[PDB]
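Batch manifest line 1392
LIGAND: chloride ion
JOB: complex structure
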Amino acid sequence: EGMWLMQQLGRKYAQMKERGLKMKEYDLYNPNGTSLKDAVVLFDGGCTGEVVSDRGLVLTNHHCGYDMIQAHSTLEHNYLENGFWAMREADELPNKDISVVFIDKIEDVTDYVKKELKAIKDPNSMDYLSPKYLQKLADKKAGKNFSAKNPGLSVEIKAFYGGNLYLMFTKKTYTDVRLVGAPPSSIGKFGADTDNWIWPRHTGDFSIFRIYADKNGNPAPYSEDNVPLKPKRFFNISLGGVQENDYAMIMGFPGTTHRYFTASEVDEWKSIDNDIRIRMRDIRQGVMLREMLADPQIKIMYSAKYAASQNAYKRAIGANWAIKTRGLRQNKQAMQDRLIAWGAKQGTPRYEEAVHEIDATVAKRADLRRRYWMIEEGIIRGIEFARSPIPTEDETKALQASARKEAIDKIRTRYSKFANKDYSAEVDKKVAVAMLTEYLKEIPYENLPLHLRLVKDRFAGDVQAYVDDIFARSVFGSEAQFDAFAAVPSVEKLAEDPMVLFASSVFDEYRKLYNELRPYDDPILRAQRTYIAGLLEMDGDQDQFPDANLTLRFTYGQVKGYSPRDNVYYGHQTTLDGVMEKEDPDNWEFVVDPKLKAVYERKDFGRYADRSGRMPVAFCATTHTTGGNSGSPVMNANGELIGLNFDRNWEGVGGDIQYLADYQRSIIVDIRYVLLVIDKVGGCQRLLDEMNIVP
Amino acid sequence: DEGMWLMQQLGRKYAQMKERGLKMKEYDLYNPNGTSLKDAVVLFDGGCTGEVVSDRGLVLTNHHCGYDMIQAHSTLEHNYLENGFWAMREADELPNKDISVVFIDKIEDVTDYVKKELKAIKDPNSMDYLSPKYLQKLADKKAGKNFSAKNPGLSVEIKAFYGGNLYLMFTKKTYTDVRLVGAPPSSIGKFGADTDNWIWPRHTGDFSIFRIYADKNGNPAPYSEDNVPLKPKRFFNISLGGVQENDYAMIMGFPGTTHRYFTASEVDEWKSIDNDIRIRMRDIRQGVMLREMLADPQIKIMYSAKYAASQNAYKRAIGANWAIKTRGLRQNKQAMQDRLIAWGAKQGTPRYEEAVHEIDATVAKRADLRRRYWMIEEGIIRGIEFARSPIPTEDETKALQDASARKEAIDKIRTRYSKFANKDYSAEVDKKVAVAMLTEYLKEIPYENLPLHLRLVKDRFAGDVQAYVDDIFARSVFGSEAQFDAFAAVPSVEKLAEDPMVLFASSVFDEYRKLYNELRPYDDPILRAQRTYIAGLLEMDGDQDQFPDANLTLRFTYGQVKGYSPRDNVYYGHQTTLDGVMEKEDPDNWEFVVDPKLKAVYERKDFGRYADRSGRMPVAFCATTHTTGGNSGSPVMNANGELIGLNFDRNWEGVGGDIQYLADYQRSIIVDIRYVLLVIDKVGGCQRLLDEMNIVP
Ligand SMILES: [Cl-]
Ligand SMILES: [Cl-]
Ligand SMILES: [Cl-]
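JOB STATUS: finished
ARTIFACT:
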């Protein structure tokens, strides 16, 4: 069920052994020695990766290395669709702005931090959650010259359990991380967006990097003189495969969970956050898809923006499915009723008062939060011309020296970014008319961004006329209209420009609401510190995990499918047969790499096929994962690598609030399929020879 | 492969059926000289199957089989189709006009008799051996003069089987007083509506209840208040034992058509002409229609039925093409015919090879015409509503060119215009369908082969399909009400003769009939060659492990209650539950609304003896029986011959099964008799129906 601190491995090891863990506790995590933990990295700030050779080879997801593959892709060498295989170390490609982070040491500093916080005075100081304050405390504990005396090392303190527990991490950061290997996009992103959040899955979602360092294996920025890192620990690769019910475990960096939501917060998340996102994105996506299906040129222009909107749309459909069908609200009521009853028995009313502060804060902000999500989904991300240019002060002064031309030239640049290759004013007008029609139905006049009152006042409720007028009269309405402005620019034109006044007033309302709502965060944070303290004192720090906060966690469970619905079973394992049956040459998302087809047709699976002679692609597990777990190593009972986490099924997204044992799975690319693609598709034998592959 | 067997073939099959789990004795299932379970099976209303389930003539069939009857008794006041219908007394059971139920009283092999008669050959290429007229003449001859009057309610029919190598005479007993007794609400009877058609898993309670009435003697009689329920020879016992994975199941009913003896060439033709054209042309039409329906709620209401009617055979063609591509249908027919050619050479009889060569050469020869025929039928005849706009008759053109016969000919033409341009017709939607269909049609059909009027697109309108179509509606008498009324006020023959919509409809129907007439001569040589082909197959492999094509005659099929894997890592089980109904519930989608009395039953777990051992409420199951169109309403029997369900659908993955049974994909979709009884009991509250049935533990 949980995402456990490395500190909590002692407490869980017995349970883990019962479930079939075979390795010694300290080979998995040793607080004062080298352990398997030392082979796990935070990859590029948002993913997990793992070291898989004694020359610093790193596996992570294809979607995690996507930006680095694309940044090295040209018309000449298109690595994004052809894939990339460095045939010698010297051909591995440097990456600007990349990091991998090792967790060198972890320390409980809870008492240290609570001692320091007693120098407060102000009882509702938010210093106990402030990264600046906790960094001051980290530096004090580490030393004034720590990073100078310990090259490559830094320290960080983070709050857990709502501020009831503090850990200090000693981190080692490398920034010379080179692209070694990537499958073609047809494999790395086979389902593309259609199979996002979907099990069964057939995606070979991996890419390969290498950590470089100085002659001593100490971090250094890119240099021709850097050499592969010789790490203290790397994963062995298993070719023994998985069977239904096999023990599996993951280490990685889950981003965020909401395991201590009150019932009132579940209702809020459903009825404001989720319902508004779902309603507004469905309107936006409906207009966009009509327009994409009618015009192939609009399809090419709007396809990335359509997919970008669909991704969190799907997550929200999945979350609301959990709220409706798995009793998330009811289970949090039960949790808080049980605490309140226990606090009544003990004669301590602070737990009931804490739950009541949370309910009262949620109820008080309901209207503001609804108006925020309506403007953010409806307009800020719903309407492209919400993000049209707004003149700075350094521009309006300059228009009224003769650096008039500098101001125009800056605004021109911003206009061209807004009205770029992928912008259609006609599509944006149709989307705007549909989104504004919904917004104006849901937000009363007295709550409208100032400019949107003109719909009632000037335009007699005609949303189409209001939108038509914004584009007819705006200097950003068309290239011709801007060039007329740029020739005879006056500050009076800009100050009265309908698109500028639109963009200004919707962004004013958005910030006004943001600023009104941020105060309501703190009483909930403070009440949560007391709430979670009560939950742990009542039920113990043993069957209820601290919310994810982008720190190293382990999770364990089994290779197991699930039943999505009556009379339907999804198994634990997909095969290359599943790729071939999805092949559709005319649908760019489901194209199959010819070498991979050939490999399938000729059953050229070598040592990577299963018992049956069938070629595995992916499996799913009852491990507890969330965003941040993307490139996480999946381990054997023996701690050998059996795959790479890359997704989770939509039925499981509500698992950030309440783990769903019968529906929530981690979606994992089989390491056997990873090696097959390297070997038979990449022809990159040196990478196989460099890894340690166990019979 | 796994078959639709003649009742005659039960003898030679019984042993295999027994080792598959059949317990009941052979002559309790079918006895040619006595009462058997065969006597409880009816052809329901010409197309469906039903079964007698009481000694007071109660009949079960599907909801979709009893739909029109349920609807014809529905008003705003008592909407039976929405709320269901539960006659609390026999007297309250509603008569239906134009209904029948046909019992198969006797079946007889008359092969020798028909072959003896056929020898009075003039022409050796005579198609009389398949002519229903000629076989009716041979049946009347054999049955006797005035058999009609000498045995009221009885009738005789001879049918050809195995391409004219086997003939059966059927004695049929027909009842026409068949009363509506019971129906679930539409929300149960067609729960998935069209979304779940051809879909497993399936959660539809597809049943309705009738009663056969007769005279005092239990002889057939038209409706009269004097008629009394039929006391039948035989009815089904109902089982509450239920089903488990791998249980024996069998079906009897009236499968309509199969093509089990297609050559490889005929499979290629079916795929590349019939199915690819229907798929391509209906995808164009459905695409335009859906965009118009989604943009305008009024068009949605107007075009919903037309959209749905287009989709049914669309989905079938997609399933059928999937089987051809993925299940080796073409390769298996090629192997079957290569087998017979090999055996033929060793017998020193080349006529088998000559017969397959005749079919291949005929299929090859007619390819171009048949492509043109499907293109115009799918593209225009079916594709474009204004293809079926009024055409003035010979006698209406004639009558318009000195009397008050003029106001007669104009009123005939107004009724046909009003029928075409009815409350569901949008000229604007039709113009957009027509532009897309004609563009595809004109791409595929060269100028030389176009209906004469479609030549104007090139010659008059410089290739502008939109202009051509705009012009038809602008200037045509039937382009709008105003334009017709203007014509009706001052009608000329010369107006109609040059009307562009008339010339279009006329022109496309001319070409449709020309292609049909050119294609007909190719049927006969394939039919005679098929007589020889199937003759050879029977002689080579025996009348044992290859069944005759369906031909709407009574057949039995057996297999097991078993799910299947549609694709990698996906398994569908053998049994759906009421839980699956609740999972699909969607109050804002008329297809997936859940009856409140049924939701309460689920919530209270009020299932009585109808729930399975685990206390789950079963809804539907699926079996490896071999069914097709015509098997709707068919009784599904236990190993002991007790009713365990009603067949009601088949999964899309199994539609290629009309050419080649597909053991790992093809399933009969069956409503669980336990769910039928639950719905009668706890939704209809119609206890008298339960007491009238014979229910075994
Ligand atoms: Cl290291
Ligand atoms: Cl011969
Ligand atoms: Cl099969």
